[PDB]
């Protein structure tokens, strides 16, 4: 066998965050990593029609300090992604261009209902502690409804269920009626709430890295060299000795110390343990799913939106839409101009049935309505990813809780079992699901283990991140009238 | 490689029926078997002082003819679970008795609710084929709530709410808020409706085996031989070749012309597939949690609630009670007395933090109360699983389908990949979660093969059961009242109407 003194199953962002993070300490460290190549929900492709492309996560913003920083050391920089023009709502078959991240609502009701949702969402979300979204104070009974029955509640007009309804959508890549209201308020709240997840400019969407973020685990790889061993799948955990055994597929077997389990929960199902894991552990990986997207890239000769003053975002409600939401993916130098844009949850498993070329005249369509120019129906090169076919992911961008599991089950997702600890975006408690996430997870679980060890104290666990000077944070702000303008209800007990 | 024409996955009931509907016909089977044992979900344990208790899947009953045919042929035979004295039903802490399968309700707005509830989830069963769930008019509406959100439209009363309650605890060992509305109307109505799936005699808890259930499994292991691998948990399939490789984790290759997997859906997690299955599967059994049981059995020195004219049937209702249901479980001889009792649902995760004398405690001393017997107090033996803790099941009973999986991805369940067909209860289309369910499953299964092999013609992989001889159906009925009687709002229309 292999010895080493840790054990990283998995070699996405977490994984080599991890590893990286144990290297530099001075262990050595193997990294086991089921594909072919390295970073996971993140892939960047390359060819010379789009020179570089995320097919995978992409989007990094404020806030976001541990990614930024990391990212910054292997020597990567970012870009910001186009929102000099107006934005676009397309509401009812037409197009209501607009500024600012929320589309503007004229209906005096309907801006009530509109602004209370959304105000609503983060009212709720002060009450649920970011590390432990199970001890909200409702956590019982919001985790006992789905999101499709609190937006039946609170939204009382149908403009704003569609728009929140898309959302939660594009947000978690899932029905509202698929997720918990609990882990869905905890999700946007450990993101910094609505504006700040929503957001392009101040947000969640700022930023994209110069060549692509697969280069975060690929240069991590090259730092680690023939210590990341591809196409090495776990089988097999052995707890029972001295040592932690770890078996692949390709029948390796490796021992170490500790192990760091840096793989989507859900996955941990495709590991045999002995001995068998705890009762909790063993049903929680049952219950974990991940959503379900196809990322589109649609390239174009020119950015020809931005001759109309529209920077290409695109919110597109209704059923017929194949996709809801896009943004600007041409290059900083303003070639390879391109829309991105998702088709999300029961739409991805719908449309998937077709071809490629099927798919690219749909979102041409598409556009061509939205965007209001003929120039969309002519497409010079088209790239996709459907994420629901990936063995090794389970889905994109992440786990989501259906209603009762998180209360139930949520403690467990980061408890160690005996000698292996857990990494991996869902167990971050800030911008959990996304890139952040993953190396705050990495970071954490690595120095539980040099805190096993004895070679740093309890209190150097959770480490608190500088603000990057690149990416600084704006505040969040709102007005006198977003915080006391009242419900549609609230409206009613005053007549 | 060890070479034959099919691989069974999984040596539960299904897979044992499936292997031996294949031997039958004269072809050569494995069965790999992750376990050091067979019957999967079912558990039979033999020691002195129980001398033999299921501690897994246990009751048969009328309309489940497969089971009782595969253990008839297999020289077993049943006896009645002992419904000759009163049930119980306790709420608001006390002990009501009553005889018949539903407990009798006086008030008559609540009497109202209840025959319009359990009516209700009958005439909405109809609506939903067996065998395409997905194909019901309101599927989508139905799928897109939990049963906690039907409850909550449907009961105008507390009384219904908390029986509709237990009932779907008692029956899918999940919470309401947990489970799709389509997937548990589609559940009940594939076991032939409310009446048939509660009742004791005449439904689904009638009977147990006179031995214990794991002799299915193990008599088909004896016809078998050694062609059953225990300790072969399966690790890998790859179709990329002319013959399908199966590999275990013990290091041994199996090469077949087909594969059955007869193992719970999200279990084929935990095999790694050459090539990656199809998207739908891929993401199907990553969506389809089983349920969260505890099967507890406290013995006595005597069936002592029969002397009270109980039967030791008890539904307990109330969030202190442990126990949701229990059943007497004393020997046909009338030995080895006994009381099984189920902890259900979230009690499952909350009771597993104890110890198994803790449990056994708080057992007695709510039976002491429910059966008012300071008797109940003095157990003489208990045995007890937590189905929760197994590797190889996942839970208990059976799997169960959160809001919008059913629709989305319920047609891939029993869809073939390449030259993998699919078994386990879980596929069957009546009694689907039982030990029938594992029987049809399993020969459905083996039949899709024979079919793709040349042997039988395609109207013969789904095939009719006769009706037991020993085991006979009485119809399920209604009375004029039951069928016409207003519902609450009903009620409440009539009221407006009249008055104007
Ligand atoms: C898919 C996706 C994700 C995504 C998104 C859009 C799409 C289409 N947009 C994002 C965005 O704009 N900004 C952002 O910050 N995130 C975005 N996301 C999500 C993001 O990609 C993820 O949060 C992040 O990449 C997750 O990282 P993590 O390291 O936690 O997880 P992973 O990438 O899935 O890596 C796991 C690795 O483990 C390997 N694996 C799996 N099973 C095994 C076994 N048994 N043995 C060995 N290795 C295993 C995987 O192959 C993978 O490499
Ligand atoms: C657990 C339980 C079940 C149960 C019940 C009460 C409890 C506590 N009460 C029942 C009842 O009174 N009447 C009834 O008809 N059913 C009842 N249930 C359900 C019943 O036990 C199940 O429906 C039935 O036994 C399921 O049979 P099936 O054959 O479909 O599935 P299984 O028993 O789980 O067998 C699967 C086998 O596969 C093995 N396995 C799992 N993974 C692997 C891998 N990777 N490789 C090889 N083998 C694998 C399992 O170990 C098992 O033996
Ligand atoms: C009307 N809707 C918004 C449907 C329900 C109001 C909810 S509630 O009446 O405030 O409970
Ligand atoms: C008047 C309000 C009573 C609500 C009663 N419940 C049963 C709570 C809801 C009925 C829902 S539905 O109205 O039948 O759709
Ligand atoms: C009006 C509006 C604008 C943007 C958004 N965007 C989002 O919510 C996003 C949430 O998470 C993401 C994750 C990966 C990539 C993109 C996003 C979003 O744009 C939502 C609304 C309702
Ligand atoms: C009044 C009453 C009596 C029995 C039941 N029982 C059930 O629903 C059961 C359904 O599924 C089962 C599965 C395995 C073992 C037992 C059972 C039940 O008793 C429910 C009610 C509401």
């Given at each position: 066998?292999?010895?080493?003194?840790?054990v990283?199953?998995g070699?996405?962002?977490?994984?080599?965050?991890?590893?990286?993070?144990l290297?530099?300490?001075?262990?050595?460290?193997?990294?086991l990593?089921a594909?072919?190549?390295?970073?996971?929900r993140?892939?960047?492709?390359?060819?010379?029609?789009?020179?570089?492309?995320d097919?995978?996560g992409?989007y990094?913003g404020?806030?976001?300090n541990?990614i930024?920083?990391?990212?910054?050391?292997?020597?990567?920089?970012?870009?910001?992604?186009?929102?000099?023009?107006?934005?676009?709502?397309?509401?009812?078959?037409?197009?209501?261009?607009?500024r600012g991240?929320?589309?503007?609502?004229?209906?005096?009701?309907?801006?009530?209902?509109?602004?209370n949702?959304?105000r609503?969402?983060?009212?709720?979300?002060?009450?649920?502690?970011?590390?432990?979204?199970?001890?909200?104070?409702?956590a019982?009974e919001?985790?006992?409804?789905?999101?499709?029955?609190?937006?039946?509640?609170?939204?009382?007009?149908?403009?704003?269920?569609?728009?929140?309804?898309?959302f939660?959508?594009?947000?978690?890549?899932?029905?509202?009626?698929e997720?918990?209201?609990?882990?869905?308020?905890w999700?946007?709240?450990?993101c910094?709430?609505?504006?700040?997840?929503?957001?392009?400019?101040n947000?969640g969407?700022?930023?994209?890295?110069?060549?692509?973020?697969?280069?975060?685990?690929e240069?991590?790889?090259?730092?680690?060299?023939?210590?990341?061993?591809?196409?090495r799948?776990?089988?097999?955990?052995?707890?029972?000795?001295?040592?932690?055994?770890?078996?692949?597929?390709?029948?390796?077997?490796?021992?170490?110390?500790?192990?760091?389990?840096?793989?989507?929960?859900?996955?941990?199902?495709?590991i045999?343990?002995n001995?068998?894991?705890?009762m909790?552990?063993?049903?929680?990986?049952?219950?974990?799913?991940?959503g379900?997207?196809?990322?589109?890239?649609?390239?174009?000769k020119?950015?020809?939106?931005?001759?109309?003053?529209?920077?290409?975002?695109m919110?597109?409600d209704?059923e017929?839409?194949?996709?809801?939401?896009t943004?600007?993916?041409?290059?900083?130098?303003?070639?390879?101009?391109?829309?991105?844009?998702?088709?999300?949850?029961?739409?991805?498993?719908?449309?998937?049935?077709?071809?490629?070329?099927?798919?690219?005249?749909?979102?041409?369509?598409?556009y061509?309505?939205?965007?209001?120019?003929?120039?969309?129906?002519?497409?010079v090169?088209?790239?996709?990813?459907?994420?629901?076919?990936?063995?090794?992911?389970?889905?994109?961008?992440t786990?989501?809780?259906?209603?009762?599991?998180?209360?139930?089950?949520?403690?467990?997702?980061?408890?160690?079992?005996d000698?292996?600890?857990?990494?991996?975006?869902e167990?971050?408690?800030?911008?959990?699901?996304?890139?952040?996430?993953?190396?705050?997870?990495?970071?954490?679980?690595?120095r539980?283990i040099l805190?096993?060890?004895?070679?740093?104290p309890?209190?150097?666990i959770w480490?608190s991140?500088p603000?990057?000077?690149?990416?600084?944070?704006?505040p969040?702000?709102?007005?006198?009238?977003?915080?006391?303008?009242?419900?549609?209800?609230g409206?009613?007990?005053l007549?």
């Open positions: 066998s292999n010895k080493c003194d840790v990283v199953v070699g996405g962002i977490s994984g080599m965050a991890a590893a990286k993070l290297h530099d300490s001075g262990l050595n460290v193997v990294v990593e594909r072919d190549r390295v970073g996971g993140t892939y960047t492709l390359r060819n010379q029609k789009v020179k570089y492309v097919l995978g992409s990094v404020p806030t976001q541990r930024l920083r990391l990212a910054k050391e292997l020597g990567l920089e970012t870009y910001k992604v186009n929102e000099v023009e107006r934005l676009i709502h397309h509401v009812k078959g037409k197009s209501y261009p607009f991240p929320f589309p503007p609502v004229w209906n005096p009701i309907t801006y009530l209902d509109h602004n949702f959304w609503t969402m983060d009212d709720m979300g002060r009450e649920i502690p970011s590390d432990a979204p199970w001890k909200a104070p409702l019982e919001w985790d006992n409804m789905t999101m499709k029955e609190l937006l039946d509640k609170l939204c009382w007009t149908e403009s704003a269920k569609q728009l929140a309804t898309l939660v959508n594009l947000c978690v890549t899932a029905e509202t009626h997720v918990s209201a609990l882990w869905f308020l999700y946007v709240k450990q910094g709430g609505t504006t700040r997840i929503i957001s392009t400019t947000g969407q700022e930023r994209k890295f110069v060549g692509g973020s697969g280069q975060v685990s240069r991590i790889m090259d730092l680690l060299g023939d210590r990341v061993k591809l196409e799948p776990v089988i097999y955990i052995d707890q029972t000795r001295e040592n932690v055994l770890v078996e692949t597929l390709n029948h390796e077997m490796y021992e170490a110390k500790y192990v760091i389990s840096a793989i989507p929960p859900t996955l941990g199902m495709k045999h343990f001995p068998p894991l705890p909790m552990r063993n049903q929680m990986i049952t219950r974990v799913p991940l379900s997207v196809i990322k589109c890239i649609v390239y174009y020119e950015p020809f939106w931005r001759k109309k003053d529209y920077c290409g975002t919110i597109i209704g017929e839409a194949p996709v809801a939401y943004l600007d993916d041409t290059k900083p130098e303003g070639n390879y101009a391109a829309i991105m844009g998702f088709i999300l949850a029961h739409k991805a498993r719908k449309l998937a049935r077709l071809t490629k070329e099927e798919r690219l005249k749909k979102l041409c369509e598409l061509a309505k939205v965007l209001g120019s003929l120039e969309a129906l002519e497409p090169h088209y790239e996709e990813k459907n994420w629901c076919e990936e063995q090794y992911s389970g889905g994109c961008y786990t989501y809780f259906p209603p009762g599991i998180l209360t139930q089950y949520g403690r467990v997702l980061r408890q160690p079992v000698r292996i600890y857990f990494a991996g975006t167990t971050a408690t800030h911008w959990s699901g996304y890139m952040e996430g993953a190396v705050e997870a990495g970071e954490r679980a690595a539980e805190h096993a060890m004895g070679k740093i309890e209190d150097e480490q991140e603000e990057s000077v690149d990416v600084p944070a704006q969040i702000t709102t007005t006198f009238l977003e915080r006391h303008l009242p419900s549609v209800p409206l009613l007990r007549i």
